[PDB]
Design a protein around this motif. Structure first.
Motif, PDB file in Angstrom:
ATOM      1  N   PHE A 177       2.314 -12.800   2.195  1.00  0.00           N
ATOM      2  CA  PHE A 177       3.247 -11.826   2.720  1.00  0.00           C
ATOM      3  C   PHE A 177       4.045 -10.974   1.819  1.00  0.00           C
ATOM      4  CE2 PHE A 177       7.108 -10.244   5.052  1.00  0.00           C
ATOM      5  CZ  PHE A 177       6.549  -9.391   5.814  1.00  0.00           C
ATOM      6  N   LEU A 178       4.542 -11.912   0.784  1.00  0.00           N
ATOM      7  CA  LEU A 178       5.463 -11.339  -0.284  1.00  0.00           C
ATOM      8  C   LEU A 178       4.517 -10.430  -0.952  1.00  0.00           C
ATOM      9  CD1 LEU A 178       7.819 -13.986  -1.102  1.00  0.00           C
ATOM     10  CD2 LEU A 178       8.251 -11.751  -0.339  1.00  0.00           C
ATOM     11  N   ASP A 179       3.107 -10.651  -1.537  1.00  0.00           N
ATOM     12  CA  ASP A 179       2.428  -9.744  -2.175  1.00  0.00           C
ATOM     13  C   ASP A 179       1.983  -8.639  -1.368  1.00  0.00           C
ATOM     14  OD1 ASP A 179       2.403 -11.842  -3.803  1.00  0.00           O
ATOM     15  OD2 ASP A 179       0.502 -11.928  -4.358  1.00  0.00           O
ATOM     16  N   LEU A 180       2.033  -8.536   0.125  1.00  0.00           N
ATOM     17  CA  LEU A 180       1.632  -7.299   0.950  1.00  0.00           C
ATOM     18  C   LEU A 180       3.028  -6.461   0.816  1.00  0.00           C
ATOM     19  CD1 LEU A 180      -0.015  -7.439   4.176  1.00  0.00           C
ATOM     20  CD2 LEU A 180       2.011  -6.121   3.884  1.00  0.00           C
ATOM     21  N   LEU A 181       4.185  -7.036   0.638  1.00  0.00           N
ATOM     22  CA  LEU A 181       5.329  -6.294   0.576  1.00  0.00           C
ATOM     23  C   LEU A 181       5.364  -5.631  -0.980  1.00  0.00           C
ATOM     24  CD1 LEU A 181       8.783  -8.033   1.728  1.00  0.00           C
ATOM     25  CD2 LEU A 181       7.056  -6.283   2.710  1.00  0.00           C
ATOM     26  N   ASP A 182       4.611  -6.562  -1.991  1.00  0.00           N
ATOM     27  CA  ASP A 182       4.328  -5.514  -3.326  1.00  0.00           C
ATOM     28  C   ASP A 182       3.427  -4.439  -3.475  1.00  0.00           C
ATOM     29  OD1 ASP A 182       6.239  -7.480  -4.173  1.00  0.00           O
ATOM     30  OD2 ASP A 182       5.034  -7.718  -6.068  1.00  0.00           O
ATOM     31  N   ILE A 183       2.498  -4.649  -2.234  1.00  0.00           N
ATOM     32  CA  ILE A 183       1.432  -3.360  -1.987  1.00  0.00           C
ATOM     33  C   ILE A 183       2.470  -2.397  -1.472  1.00  0.00           C
ATOM     34  CG2 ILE A 183      -0.447  -2.753  -0.542  1.00  0.00           C
ATOM     35  CD1 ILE A 183      -1.129  -4.410  -2.850  1.00  0.00           C
ATOM     36  N   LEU A 184       3.050  -2.518  -0.397  1.00  0.00           N
ATOM     37  CA  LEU A 184       3.839  -1.487   0.242  1.00  0.00           C
ATOM     38  C   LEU A 184       4.880  -0.895  -0.499  1.00  0.00           C
ATOM     39  CD1 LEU A 184       4.472  -2.330   3.953  1.00  0.00           C
ATOM     40  CD2 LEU A 184       2.940  -1.047   3.039  1.00  0.00           C
ATOM     41  N   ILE A 185       5.261  -1.658  -1.786  1.00  0.00           N
ATOM     42  CA  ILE A 185       6.316  -1.040  -2.514  1.00  0.00           C
ATOM     43  C   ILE A 185       5.607  -0.354  -3.723  1.00  0.00           C
ATOM     44  CG2 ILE A 185       7.875  -1.463  -4.606  1.00  0.00           C
ATOM     45  CD1 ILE A 185       9.136  -3.829  -2.994  1.00  0.00           C
ATOM     46  N   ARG A 186       4.392  -0.775  -4.025  1.00  0.00           N
ATOM     47  CA  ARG A 186       3.625  -0.102  -5.673  1.00  0.00           C
ATOM     48  C   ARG A 186       2.765   0.829  -4.986  1.00  0.00           C
ATOM     49  NH1 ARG A 186       2.530  -5.073  -9.985  1.00  0.00           N
ATOM     50  NH2 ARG A 186       4.714  -5.292 -10.288  1.00  0.00           N
ATOM     51  N   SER A 187       1.781   0.737  -4.420  1.00  0.00           N
ATOM     52  CA  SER A 187       0.721   1.388  -4.052  1.00  0.00           C
ATOM     53  C   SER A 187       0.232   1.530  -2.452  1.00  0.00           C
ATOM     54  CB  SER A 187      -0.549   1.235  -4.862  1.00  0.00           C
ATOM     55  OG  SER A 187      -1.840   1.657  -4.555  1.00  0.00           O
ATOM     56  N   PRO A 188       0.989   2.141  -1.680  1.00  0.00           N
ATOM     57  CA  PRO A 188       0.359   2.005  -0.319  1.00  0.00           C
ATOM     58  C   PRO A 188      -1.092   2.496  -0.137  1.00  0.00           C
ATOM     59  CG  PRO A 188       2.639   2.780  -0.250  1.00  0.00           C
ATOM     60  CD  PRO A 188       2.069   2.814  -1.763  1.00  0.00           C
ATOM     61  N   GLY A 189      -1.429   3.318  -0.896  1.00  0.00           N
ATOM     62  CA  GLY A 189      -2.710   3.810  -0.506  1.00  0.00           C
ATOM     63  C   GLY A 189      -3.920   3.304  -1.280  1.00  0.00           C
ATOM     64  N   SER A 190      -3.600   2.111  -1.656  1.00  0.00           N
ATOM     65  CA  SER A 190      -4.527   0.994  -2.426  1.00  0.00           C
ATOM     66  C   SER A 190      -5.694   0.705  -1.453  1.00  0.00           C
ATOM     67  CB  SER A 190      -4.031   0.016  -3.299  1.00  0.00           C
ATOM     68  OG  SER A 190      -4.936  -0.981  -3.524  1.00  0.00           O
ATOM     69  N   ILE A 191      -6.797   0.229  -2.195  1.00  0.00           N
ATOM     70  CA  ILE A 191      -7.780  -0.543  -1.134  1.00  0.00           C
ATOM     71  C   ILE A 191      -7.240  -1.945  -0.661  1.00  0.00           C
ATOM     72  CG2 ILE A 191      -8.950  -0.972  -3.203  1.00  0.00           C
ATOM     73  CD1 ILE A 191     -10.393  -0.532   0.259  1.00  0.00           C
ATOM     74  N   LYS A 192      -6.588  -2.447  -1.579  1.00  0.00           N
ATOM     75  CA  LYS A 192      -6.178  -3.909  -1.420  1.00  0.00           C
ATOM     76  C   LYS A 192      -5.475  -4.112  -0.186  1.00  0.00           C
ATOM     77  CE  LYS A 192      -5.650  -4.339  -6.580  1.00  0.00           C
ATOM     78  NZ  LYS A 192      -4.651  -4.901  -7.554  1.00  0.00           N
ATOM     79  N   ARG A 193      -4.712  -3.483   0.210  1.00  0.00           N
ATOM     80  CA  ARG A 193      -3.882  -3.921   1.581  1.00  0.00           C
ATOM     81  C   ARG A 193      -4.749  -4.161   2.552  1.00  0.00           C
ATOM     82  NH1 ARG A 193      -4.023   0.602   4.856  1.00  0.00           N
ATOM     83  NH2 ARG A 193      -2.825  -0.717   6.429  1.00  0.00           N
ATOM     84  N   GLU A 194      -6.101  -3.279   2.687  1.00  0.00           N
ATOM     85  CA  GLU A 194      -6.980  -3.480   3.616  1.00  0.00           C
ATOM     86  C   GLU A 194      -7.346  -5.192   3.606  1.00  0.00           C
ATOM     87  OE1 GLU A 194      -7.024   0.826   5.019  1.00  0.00           O
ATOM     88  OE2 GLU A 194      -7.283  -0.940   5.878  1.00  0.00           O
ATOM     89  N   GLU A 195      -8.090  -5.270   2.384  1.00  0.00           N
ATOM     90  CA  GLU A 195      -8.132  -6.649   2.044  1.00  0.00           C
ATOM     91  C   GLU A 195      -7.112  -7.660   2.338  1.00  0.00           C
ATOM     92  OE1 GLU A 195      -9.512  -7.359  -1.805  1.00  0.00           O
ATOM     93  OE2 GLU A 195     -11.228  -7.515  -1.364  1.00  0.00           O
ATOM     94  N   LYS A 196      -5.848  -7.315   2.146  1.00  0.00           N
ATOM     95  CA  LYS A 196      -4.619  -7.948   2.273  1.00  0.00           C
ATOM     96  C   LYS A 196      -4.343  -8.055   3.740  1.00  0.00           C
ATOM     97  CE  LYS A 196      -2.066  -9.891  -0.750  1.00  0.00           C
ATOM     98  NZ  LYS A 196      -2.550 -10.389  -1.920  1.00  0.00           N
TER      99      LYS A 196
END
Lengths: 78, 49
Positions: free
Chosen positions: A11-30
């Motif tokens: 969950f904290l790394d998903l917050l890091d996704i939402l902080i850094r690069s919301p358009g990344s592919i990884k959030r779908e993985e996340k």
């Protein structure tokens, strides 16, 4: 305990996704990733369910045995 | 009114960049709401079953 801590850190790394690069592919993985983690946290504790089932039979038998002896002793006193 | 148009023709490209900016920020807002939505669909649909 490992899966609890892994759920919180993902969950904290998903917050890091939402902080850094919301358009990344990884959030779908996340947004898949912790889902898999949640599945395992259910799937382990469902494996406590036969055991709990077997164990309640055991304590029922113990209580059953004790009650028989109690009535026996009660009756003998009478 | 055509003279007003050809006056604004210098200011056209900045408004094009502004439209690009606005589209980009709207996209990131939809990303935030989509993340919250998929977490709700995890927490109320898949885990209950």
């Amino acid at each position: 305990r490992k899966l609890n801590m892994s759920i919180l850190i993902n969950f904290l790394d998903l917050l890091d996704i939402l902080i850094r690069s919301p358009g990344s592919i990884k959030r779908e993985e996340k947004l898949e990733d912790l889902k898999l983690l949640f599945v395992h946290v259910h799937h382990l504790i469902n494996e406590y369910r036969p055991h709990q089932a077997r164990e309640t039979l055991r304590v029922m038998m113990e209580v059953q045995k004790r009650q028989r002896l109690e009535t026996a002793e009660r009756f003998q006193k009478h | 009114r055509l003279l007003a148009l050809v006056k604004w023709a210098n200011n056209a490209g900045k408004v094009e960049k502004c439209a690009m900016i606005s589209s980009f920020l709207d996209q990131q807002a939809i990303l935030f709401v989509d993340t919250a939505d998929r977490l709700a669909s995890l927490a109320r649909d898949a885990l209950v079953h």
